[PDB]
Amino acid sequence: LGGYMLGSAMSRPLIHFGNDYEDRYYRENMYRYPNQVYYRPVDQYSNQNSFVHDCVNITVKQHTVTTTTKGENFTETDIKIMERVVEQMCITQYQQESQAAYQRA
């Protein structure tokens, strides 16, 4: 991910758990953990969460393996709220990227 194409900036699509702390965890996990992912622009595969959750196997990394250990509290909850959002928006930006390829076409 020395390059990649930062998978847009979704500003958090609001994933809302209707929680106090785990919600908030995600709501801060929009900053500590981002609302954008690390991947290059795709529209040449079938599976989404494959390439997508992989882009987060990049993103959540950079954002939880140093970006979190900078004084954040990441628990199993953080993993999900973060991977889940960052993944499903990498997925959102997968279908977006797909059609973005249609726009650049």
Swiss-Prot record:
Residues bearing carbohydrate: 57, 73
Membrane-traversing stretches: none
Domain of life: Eukaryota
Disulfide bonds: 55-90
Location(s) in or outside the cell: Cell membrane; Golgi apparatus
Domain notes: The normal, monomeric form has a mainly alpha-helical structure. The disease-associated, protease-resistant form forms amyloid fibrils containing a cross-beta spine, formed by a steric zipper of superposed beta-strands. Disease mutations may favor intermolecular contacts via short beta strands, and may thereby trigger oligomerization. Contains an N-terminal region composed of octamer repeats. At low copper concentrations, the sidechains of His residues from three or four repeats contribute to the binding of a single copper ion. Alternatively, a copper ion can be bound by interaction with the sidechain and backbone amide nitrogen of a single His residue. The observed copper binding stoichiometry suggests that two repeat regions cooperate to stabilize the binding of a single copper ion. At higher copper concentrations, each octamer can bind one copper ion by interactions with the His sidechain and Gly backbone atoms.
Family: Belongs to the prion family.
Free-text function comment from the UniProt entry: Its primary physiological function is unclear. Has cytoprotective activity against internal or environmental stresses. May play a role in neuronal development and synaptic plasticity. May be required for neuronal myelin sheath maintenance. May play a role in iron uptake and iron homeostasis. Soluble oligomers are toxic to cultured neuroblastoma cells and induce apoptosis (in vitro). Association with GPC1 (via its heparan sulfate chains) targets PRNP to lipid rafts. Also provides Cu(2+) or Zn(2+) for the ascorbate-mediated GPC1 deaminase degradation of its heparan sulfate side chains.
Known disease link: Found in high quantity in the brain of humans and animals infected with degenerative neurological diseases such as kuru, Creutzfeldt-Jakob disease (CJD), Gerstmann-Straussler syndrome (GSS), scrapie, bovine spongiform encephalopathy (BSE), transmissible mink encephalopathy (TME), etc.
Oligomer status and interactors: Monomer and homodimer. Has a tendency to aggregate into amyloid fibrils containing a cross-beta spine, formed by a steric zipper of superposed beta-strands. Soluble oligomers may represent an intermediate stage on the path to fibril formation. Copper binding may promote oligomerization. Interacts with GRB2, APP, ERI3/PRNPIP and SYN1. Mislocalized cytosolically exposed PrP interacts with MGRN1; this interaction alters MGRN1 subcellular location and causes lysosomal enlargement. Interacts with KIAA1191.
The protein, known as: Major prion protein
Species: Oryctolagus cuniculus (Rabbit)
Gene symbol of the encoding locus: PRNP
